[PDB]
Amino acid sequence: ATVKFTGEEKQVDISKIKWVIRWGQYIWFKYDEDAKGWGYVSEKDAPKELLQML
Amino acid sequence: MTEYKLVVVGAGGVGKSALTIQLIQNHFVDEYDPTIEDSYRKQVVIDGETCLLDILDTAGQEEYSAMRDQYMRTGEGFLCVFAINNTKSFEDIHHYREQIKRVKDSEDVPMVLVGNKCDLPSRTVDTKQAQDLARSYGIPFIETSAKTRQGVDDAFYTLVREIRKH
Ligand SMILES: Nc1nc2c(ncn2[C@@H]2O[C@H](COP(=O)(O)OP(=O)(O)NP(=O)(O)O)[C@@H](O)[C@H]2O)c(=O)[nH]1
Ligand SMILES: [Ca+2]
Ligand SMILES: [Ca+2]
Ligand SMILES: [Ca+2]
Ligand SMILES: [Cl-]
Ligand SMILES: [Cl-]
Ligand SMILES: [Cl-]
Ligand SMILES: [Co+2]
Ligand SMILES: [Co+2]
Ligand SMILES: [Co+2]
Ligand SMILES: [Mg+2]
């Protein structure tokens, strides 16, 4: 799957996400390869595949 | 009013995770040490009203500062924890508070001062120091022990009350 999040609009393949939690109606995640980073998306905007990794 | 986003912050080792786990599991889990922040939900009754605590137990060493900031913007209430045998943890409080205020761009954010480990046979932070500091912030101070559970419900419930009165 792809996770789309935002002060710019970015995207990351869910295969790169190493960590994810649900808090305060948002989904919080980290991603890495070898780009490395973090992002967050509302609970109602997150892909099924991401929710499944909770 | 039904859901409350609580953030737990404080220096490494003060008992952020121990306190959170005492609230959730109603006992002291020894050797519990998540390295990354984690969230916990609990249904509780506070002053009649049933409500959902959505609790973020922050990492000792948050890797992303902007991620720390976004957590703070999203949180409604903050448990600022120090340990009564660690003066450094207590001096940190001043900076947690004004960092939180800076980041949420607000002069009045719901907070509670927590001095954990009051089961310990020694003190380096005097009760007077913490009470004077809390009074200057106009917030509650609650001395706790995640080991004995002394003050634990009280610390989280009082934070909810600070939120209810905005
Ligand atoms: N005596 C006593 N020890 C405590 C108490 N709360 C936590 N500790 C101990 O102090 C240490 C730190 O606890 P911990 O819960 O990991 O603190 P933390 O603030 O979550 N650490 P980190 O920020 O690195 O996640 C552990 O050895 C724990 O057992 C308390 O109320 N009394
Ligand atoms: Ca970035
Ligand atoms: Ca130990
Ligand atoms: Ca206030
Ligand atoms: Cl130890
Ligand atoms: Cl600071
Ligand atoms: Cl005690
Ligand atoms: Co709320
Ligand atoms: Co148990
Ligand atoms: Co400062
Ligand atoms: Mg911890």
Residue numbers in the entry:
A (entry chain B): 1 to 6, 9 to 36, 39 to 58
B (entry chain A): 1 to 166
According to the publication:
GTPases K-Ras, H-Ras, and N-Ras comprise the most frequently mutated family of oncoproteins in human cancers, including three of the most lethal forms, cancers of the lung, colon, and pancreas. Here we present an inhibitor R11.1.6 engineered on a scaffold based on the thermostable protein Sso7d for preferential binding to K-Ras G12D and reveal an extensive hydrophobic interface on K-Ras that can be exploited in future inhibitor development. To better understand their molecular interactions, we obtained co-crystal structures of R11.1.6 bound to GppNHp-loaded K-Ras G12D and to GppNHp-loaded K-Ras WT at resolutions of 2.20 and 2.30 Å, respectively. For both mutant G12D and WT structures, the K-Ras/R11.1.6 interface consists of switch II in a conformation that selectively exposes its hydrophobic residues, which are intercalated by a series of aromatic R11.1.6 residues.
The structures show R11.1.6 makes contact with K-Ras away from the GTP-binding active site, confirming that the mutant specificity is indeed due to the mutant’s conformation rather than direct contact with the mutated residue. Switch I of GTP-bound Ras can be found in two major interconverting conformations, state 1 and state 215. Recent NMR data showed that switch I in K-Ras G12D is stabilized in state 2, while WT K-Ras has a more open and dynamic active site, with significant population of state 1 (unpublished data). In the G12D structure, switch I adopts a conformation resembling state 2, which places Glu37 and Glu63 in an orientation that favors interaction with R11.1.6 residues Lys32 and Lys40 at the periphery of the interface, providing additional stabilizing interactions to the complex. In contrast, this R11.1.6 “lysine claw” does not appear to be as strong in the WT structure, in which switch I exhibits a state 1 conformation and Lys32 is oriented away from Glu63. These differences in interaction between Lys40 and Lys32 and switch I residues appear to give rise to the greater specificity of R11.1.6 for the G12D mutant. Binding of R11.1.6 at switch II alters the position of these residues, preventing the active site from reaching a catalytically competent state. For both K-Ras G12D and WT, the intrinsic hydrolysis rate is indeed significantly impaired by the presence of R11.1.6. For both mutant G12D and WT K-Ras, the Raf RBD competed with R11.1.6 binding.
